[PDB]
Amino acid sequence: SSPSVVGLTSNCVKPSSGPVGPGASATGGYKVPEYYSFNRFSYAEAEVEMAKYRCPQPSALK
Amino acid sequence: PEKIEVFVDDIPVQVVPGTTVLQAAAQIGVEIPRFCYHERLAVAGNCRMCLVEVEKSPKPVAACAMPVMKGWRIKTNSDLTRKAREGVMEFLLMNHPLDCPICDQGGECDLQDQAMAFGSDRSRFTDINYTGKRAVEDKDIGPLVKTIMTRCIHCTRCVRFASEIAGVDDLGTTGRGNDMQIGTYVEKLFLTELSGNVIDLCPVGA
């Protein structure tokens, strides 16, 4: 998909265990296994992706 | 820049706009009790001792940092102000220690003077018999400045002076809540040509 998922690193483990945590999965109704699939370093890995897109920052000092 | 007209204590007063309430009250002549405010330091609201009531005030305002606005009415010595000041000093004097006789600022201490003028005279703090007060380890800071931080009131005069006037930048605050302390997180010496002036700034004998 053109709107891909975040980088494979940012994803703790590729969902293959289906039921995760309290019983989330792409099948079952509580469809948010992605929440329970976040790594110790998932946050930082996200911004590593986001070097690509973000626009120029304002600068006070000229 | 035309000067605003404001009735400080039922007296018309002239202030260039943006003037702070306190800076106007001195202009006329009245003085508000301050602890964290000094002429030559950045403005902060810490002590809450400079509070004052303005007619139709939902909230008493800190004169030290309150820019005056048109047609106000500042009631310096109105009972609501007196209620506020006493409460604030009951607070300050909860857990200040009982060390006036051994405190080098005895008889020169703003806390004593402003306690006399504007504070109460009875101790509602009953917990001295149950769990006592708080205490803080003193710091080693140099061969010049003797430090007894268990008297500090966290006015941040030392913090602001060092950061700005001397630019040492090595003296600051730490921690939340009643356990907030001041000093350097690790033992250092506050070495600086102007370091003496902190002794005059600290209103209390810390």
Add this chain to the structure above:
Amino acid sequence: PPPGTPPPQTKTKFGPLADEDRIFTNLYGRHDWRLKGALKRGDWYKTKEIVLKGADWIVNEIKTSGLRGRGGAGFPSGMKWSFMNKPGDGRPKYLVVNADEGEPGTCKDREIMRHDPHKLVEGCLIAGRAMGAQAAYIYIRGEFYNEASNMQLAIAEAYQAGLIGKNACGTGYDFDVFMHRGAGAYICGEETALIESLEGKQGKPRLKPPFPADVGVFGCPTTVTNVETVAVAPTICRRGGVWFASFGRTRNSGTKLFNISGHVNRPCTVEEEMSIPLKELIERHCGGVTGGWDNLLGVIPGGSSTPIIPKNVCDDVIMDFDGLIAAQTSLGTAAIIVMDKSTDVIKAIARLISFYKHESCGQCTPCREGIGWMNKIMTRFVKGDAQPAEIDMLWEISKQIEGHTICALGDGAAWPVQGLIRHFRPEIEKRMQLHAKRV
């Protein structure tokens, strides 16, 4: 009628909601949350048009929506956003979306991130246009590391799809969203303190004036706005300010989430119309008090920071920003903490005070110690060792603290003890009485 002035409502029975009217449909996560389901549930619909409308449009329909900010203070957002919309300066205007859920008893904020992060992002975009925001920052507790990543993921899908960024939704206007996971501390839920957090300073709040509309992050014009306040916004601009006035009774307009917890059979979060009786709600979406309605000692409607109300006064309470104010309590976050007839309310409240004592930056004279004092007094009361005059200390100390502190936290610490003395003083008298007799 003028551009503002939301239309008064003429309904008496503000009963349940219709799930069509529930804006947060995915709440409880029965359906997909990624951008596939989101655009299947209508999460980015005609955003290009609405954004193009301008700021005058958006602010106006907000005004006639009469929305009161759900951040706990309750001041309406239309005026807030309008202040941002004042040009005549070369500043990088910013928009801060406070997602702090520090408020004890409150859990609604968490699930918006966990189940509809796209909705919030869309809302920030529409609002950010109305605030002329150069960019925005979604400040979030450090206790929600998994949510923060989840939001980061939603930002990924949005950036990749081109919904948000430069030329977002093809409108040409630029807007980027960043995620700042502040190292958890309850005080950061304050506007000024949060701004200090983002800036990297100590974290303690600031005096007002100046307001964030004057100077905010980086000394730039900003507003801190609650997550729900933002999340509803795009739906309002997409569904009609008239319709949102269709709910609510008066100035307390719109709908709000509720978090029912405590001695409750089936506590949970419920989207439901405001201006509702509390008893009806507790028996509709909640199942009722564990010991039945009679076995009820008191409810704290706004969660912590809010005085308790006893069962008798509670029996007929209209839940809303108003109404409760008359009943001597503030709706806060609509966080209802309910306790059965049998539990130590006094040491329940003592726990709240300890929370404040541990959660108070310590910049103001009253709050750096006065809560510390209240903690000492309440602890002694809980153990039953205190002269009855300490009833008056707590009453009279509380008045001294309230109003003199900088951030509203002091008031949040002052009110609960005031409520306890007003309504459950006989309990304290008995607790002290038992100790004295044994003494």
Add this chain to the structure above:
Amino acid sequence: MGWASSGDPLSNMNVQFGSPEEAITFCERNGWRWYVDGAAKPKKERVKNYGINFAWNKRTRVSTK
């Protein structure tokens, strides 16, 4: 006994006045020699704004609170 002996009578002598011209008038009438010491010029207003603590460009941004 190592006290601070002083055989000079007008050592502690100290009097107050409302304005220097009054004092000079008094001092002459009692035939003393004197020399005024100009106190100070009127305090020049200092802006002492709160917002300067938080500025985007100016150096005056506070390092801490």
Add this chain to the structure above:
Amino acid sequence: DNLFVHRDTPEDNPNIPFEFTAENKKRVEAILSIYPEGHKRGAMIPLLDLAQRQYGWLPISAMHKVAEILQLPNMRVYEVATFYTMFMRKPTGKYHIQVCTTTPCWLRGSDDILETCKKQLGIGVGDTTKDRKFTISEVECLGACVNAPMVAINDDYYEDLTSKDMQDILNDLKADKISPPGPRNGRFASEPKGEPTSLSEEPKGPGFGLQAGL
């Protein structure tokens, strides 16, 4: 026991070498740039987070490292690194059990779970085993008041708990086996127990309830 004054201990001292590993170095470069050029000091808290996350706790050398990155006095980093609660300035350990012992978690019995935790780990509050596998801790509220009682372990949210399951959870973590976070009583996410009473209808779809004009 928490101290806002640091002494040069053998285990915590600037002499210890800390440095950002190449993986984190990239992240540091990427994260710095979300702040305008003038004010880079705002990134400090994320940087301290990353350092703690890499190391497991904050050594004073790490605070120096962040200060060196941002070119500011070492005291300012100390100020913040001491303010925020979870910036553990002492050796934490592998797992950091956090129990929210405030209302309404206290109301739902969360004293029980804390009592058991001390029993089985063998140490009291604010403590860590000689192993450092475990660290008991109390926190005010973890934003899961609704799923009360509840515990968190360094990322995790274990809610809807009791003495029985905490015993099981600790035996699991004693064995060092992965545990499934989230509630373990039948619900999943802040949803009323049993059958559902609201949002029982399919989401309408895009455009529903549009203004129909403007």
